[PDB]
Amino acid sequence: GPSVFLFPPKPKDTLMISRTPEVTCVVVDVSHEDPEVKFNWYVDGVEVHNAKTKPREEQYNSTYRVVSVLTVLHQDWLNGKEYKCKVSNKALPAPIEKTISKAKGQPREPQVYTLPPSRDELTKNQVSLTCLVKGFYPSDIAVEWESNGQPENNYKTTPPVLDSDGSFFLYSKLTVDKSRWQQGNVFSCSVMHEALHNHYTQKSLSLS
Amino acid sequence: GPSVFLFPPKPKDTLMISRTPEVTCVVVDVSHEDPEVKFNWYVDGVEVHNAKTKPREEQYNSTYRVVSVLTVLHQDWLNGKEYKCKVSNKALPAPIEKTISKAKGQPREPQVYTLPPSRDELTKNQVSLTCLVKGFYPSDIAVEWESNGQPENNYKTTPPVLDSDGSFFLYSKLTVDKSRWQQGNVFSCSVMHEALHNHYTQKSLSLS
Ligand SMILES: *[C@@H]1O[C@H](CO[C@@H]2O[C@@H](C)[C@@H](O)[C@@H](O)[C@@H]2O)[C@@H](O[C@@H]2O[C@H](CO)[C@@H](O[C@@H]3O[C@H](CO[C@H]4O[C@H](CO)[C@@H](O)[C@H](O)[C@@H]4O[C@@H]4O[C@H](CO)[C@@H](O)[C@H](O)[C@H]4NC(C)=O)[C@@H](O)[C@H](O[C@H]4O[C@H](CO)[C@@H](O)[C@H](O)[C@@H]4O[C@@H]4O[C@H](CO)[C@@H](O)[C@H](O)[C@H]4NC(C)=O)[C@@H]3O)[C@H](O)[C@H]2NC(C)=O)[C@H](O)[C@H]1NC(C)=O
Ligand SMILES: *[C@@H]1O[C@H](CO[C@@H]2O[C@@H](C)[C@@H](O)[C@@H](O)[C@@H]2O)[C@@H](O[C@@H]2O[C@H](CO)[C@@H](O[C@@H]3O[C@H](CO[C@H]4O[C@H](CO)[C@@H](O)[C@H](O)[C@@H]4O[C@@H]4O[C@H](CO)[C@@H](O)[C@H](O)[C@H]4NC(C)=O)[C@@H](O)[C@H](O[C@H]4O[C@H](CO)[C@@H](O)[C@H](O)[C@@H]4O[C@@H]4O[C@H](CO)[C@@H](O)[C@H](O)[C@H]4NC(C)=O)[C@@H]3O)[C@H](O)[C@H]2NC(C)=O)[C@H](O)[C@H]1NC(C)=O
């Protein structure tokens, strides 16, 4: 038979009121031979009726991928409500439920430190600007870079890693032309997380 | 029916001559109704017969688990040989095959850069010492920290992360008591990877 995977909203979406946070139910391996899929959604137990049940894509294995989507209240998600996605594709002897909720526990504020390039990287053409983000809980977080209020794109951020004290840390690495590190521009790492004031903080970095 | 899982050697094992690298072929969900399992092992598609196959073990869920281990030559792994585990069992229409090899791609030398604490971190109980390792390929790598010849302990290393040029990077974080960094003390981040001479480098860090 077909299987089911349930997904949390993107971290940035729950933290900024402008954005629309969603839980996503993904039904995989649904066959032509019995292709109709049903969904039912529950918050904290109660059936609600906000979900859209968007259709419906091909595949290599010629099986299907049926995806349903539910919008969620920012504060609900952050207060720990659990979301139940229920899938009925008879071909299923009984319908599948899956449940998801935010990680439990006292949210902890990230500490953010920008670290300049090593001396030895300076004999290169591009240099690495590093943002260390640590001491945060839960692991939901977003990190971005900018300069002169314009986004930097050439950066990569590690996944959150569980640290020895049970909090998380990560690093983000921005690569810039050494031209710019010397020509003196200011660069900033922005962090969004629920335990920050206004869910956001920014730390700057430039040549001292 | 039965599932097969094929595990690569540990990065350290293929990189150090003193160690012994093994590929491990594990079969789970073997039934009582058909408990016989047969392994065949192939290196670049040539059958080999020096694997060591352990007597099957009944699990608590009343299925058997059976393991076969093939010692591989360091040079063969690093030269990219493909290792095929073939598993036969009278409950399959046809044998299951898994193959594993080192990541294909030109290997690339890691660059190692040490980064001292952000000054903002001084007002802390403890402090973070950063080791950036970038530009390496394949992603198989090992990282450790020591000082005065003896291993630290209190460190965590991110998974390798795909960078925008197709090499990998990671960071490893070592936390030490603020006094020690202030005591003039000297730490070393050491890295092992196939594109290093003697498969090893180490870079030091101390309060300047
Ligand atoms: C036929 O085709 C379909 C099409 O899929 C693929 O399409 C092509 C192009 C190739 O990529 C092929 O791989 C494949 O053919 C196949 O569909 C696949 O079905 C498999 C199952 O076999 C699914 O695997 C699961 O993946 C989820 C997470 O997947 C996310 O990320 C994927 C990339 O990594 C991405 O492909 C997915 O789209 C999905 O992406 C997320 O999607 C949402 C909404 O779109 C989005 O909001 C996210 O931002 C996005 N994230 C991205 C893009 O990165 C994974 O969670 C599953 O792992 C759990 O379950 C496994 C058991 O199956 C288990 O082994 C794991 O350990 C894990 O188990 C969980 O573990 C935690 C603890 O860690 C525990 O708490 C949980 O209880 C536990 N759950 C358990 C036990 O189940 C799983 O690996 C693929 O997603 C899916 N691919 C697609 C595109 O949908 C299908 O298999 C084919 N059929 C065949 C070959 O017969
Ligand atoms: C009956 O019981 C057995 C045995 O379980 C034991 O007994 C029972 C009664 C209970 O008490 C259990 O608690 C107890 O553990 C069950 O057997 C299990 O079967 C599951 C599958 O259902 C297997 O899952 C796979 O696990 C591997 C990783 O497994 C390693 O790590 C485990 C700890 O996390 C560890 O328990 C295992 O022993 C194993 O350990 C490694 O072993 C090697 C070899 O000795 C060793 O060198 C390593 O050092 C060691 N590692 C460590 C840290 O210990 C996982 O990788 C598998 O994931 C792949 O497949 C999934 C689909 O099944 C897929 O969703 C995943 O994404 C992934 O797919 C892969 O994706 C990645 C890319 O991200 C890539 O690697 C691959 O290319 C890709 N492959 C595929 C398929 O596309 C998978 O989760 C358990 O290992 C296994 N337990 C044991 C001990 O063997 C059994 O399920 C029970 N049966 C029933 C019906 O209940």
Measured CA to CA in angstroms, residue B44 lies from B1, B41, B85 at distances of 27, 10, 11
d(CA A154, CA A174): 6
Task: Count CB atoms within 10 A of the CB of residue A119.
Answer: 10
Structure tokens at B34: 């058909």
Task: Count CB atoms within 10 A of the CB of residue A152.
Answer: 17
> Do residues B73 and B113 share a domain?
no
Cβ-count burial of A47 within 10 angstroms (0-12 exposed, 13-18 middle, 19+ buried)? exposed
**Which residues face A26 on adjacent strands?**
A5, A67
Sort strands B111-115 and B161-162 into parallel, antiparallel or unpaired.
Answer: unpaired
Residues with Cβ within 8 Å of A104's Cβ and at least 6 positions away in sequence, in order, are A80
Residue A108: cis peptide before it, omega within 30 degrees of 0: no
d(CA A138, CA A107): 6
How far the first Cα of chain B sits from its last, in Å, is 62
DSSP state of A6: E
Name the structure determination technique.
X-ray
B204: CATH: 2.60.40.10
> Do residues B73 and B84 share a domain?
yes
Read off the amino acid at residue B119. R
> Do residues B198 and B130 share a domain?
yes
Domain that holds residue B151: 102-208
> Do residues B122 and B196 share a domain?
yes
> Do residues B45 and B86 share a domain?
yes
Read off the amino acid at residue B58. E
d(CA B172, CA B51): 36
- Within an 8 Å CB–CB cutoff, is residue A162 touching chain B? yes
- Within an 8 Å CB–CB cutoff, is residue A84 touching chain B? no
Q: Which of B109, B112, B115, B202 to mutate to test the interface with A (most CBs of A within 10 A)?
A: B115
Contacts of range B70-74, beta carbons closer than 8 Å, 24 or more positions apart: B70/B22, B70/B23, B70/B24, B70/B25, B70/B41, B71/B20, B71/B21, B71/B22, B72/B9, B72/B14, B72/B21, B72/B22, B72/B23, B74/B14, B74/B15, B74/B17, B74/B21
- Selection from A110, A113, A135 nearest residue A195 by Cα: A110
- Within an 8 Å CB–CB cutoff, is residue A161 touching chain B? yes
> Do residues B109 and B51 share a domain?
no
Judge if the beta carbon of residue B26 lies within 6 A of ligand 2: yes
d(CA B53, CA B134): 39
> Do residues B95 and B109 share a domain?
no
What would the DSSP string read from start to end of B165-204?
TS-EEEEEEEEEEHHHHHTT-EEEEEEE-TTSGGGEEEEE
> Do residues B89 and B143 share a domain?
no
How far the first Cα of chain A sits from its last, in Å, is 62
Q: What does the CA dihedral A46, A48, A52, A56 come to, rounded to 10 degrees?
A: 30
Last residue of a domain, one of A69, A101, A133: A101
What would the DSSP string read from start to end of A116-183?
PPPSGGGGSSEEEEEEEEEEEBSS--EEEEEETTEE--SEEEPPPEE-TTS-EEEEEEEEEEHHHHHH
Q: Are A196 and A140 in contact (CB under 8 A)?
A: no
> Do residues B27 and B74 share a domain?
yes
Three-class DSSP category at A60:
coil
Extended strands (E) in A31-90:
38-43, 46-47, 64-71, 83-88
Q: Are A113 and B120 in contact (CB under 8 A)?
A: yes
Q: Are A198 and A191 in contact (CB under 8 A)?
A: no
Q: What is the resolution of this structure in A?
A: 1.9
CA A45 to chain centre: 25
The radius of gyration computed from the CA coordinates of chain B, to the nearest angstrom, equals 22
Burial B177-205 (b: 16+ CB within 10 A, else e): ebebbeeeeebbbbbbbbebeebebbbeb
User: Which atom of ligand 1 lies at the shortest distance from residue A65's CA?
Assistant: 92
Last residue of a domain, one of A76, A101, A126: A101
DSSP state of A89: -
Measured CA to CA in angstroms, residue B78 lies from A64, A111, A115, B195 at distances of 39, 41, 35, 10
What would the DSSP string read from start to end of chain B?
--EEEEEPPPHHHHH-TTS--EEEEEEEEE-SSS---EEEEEETTEEE---EEPPPEE-TTS-EEEEEEEE--HHHHHTT--EEEEEE-TTSSS-EEEEE-PPPS--BPPEEEEEPPPGGGGGSSEEEEEEEEEEEBSS--EEEEEETTEE---EEEPPPEE-TTS-EEEEEEEEEEHHHHHTT-EEEEEEE-TTSGGGEEEEEEE--
> Do residues A106 and A147 share a domain?
yes
Last residue of a domain, one of A101, A136, A171: A101
From the CA of A188, how many Å to the nearest CA of chain B? 14
> Do residues A9 and A70 share a domain?
yes
**Which residues face A64 on adjacent strands?**
A30
Q: How many domains does chain A have?
A: 2
Q: Are A159 and B158 in contact (CB under 8 A)?
A: yes
> Do residues B9 and B79 share a domain?
yes
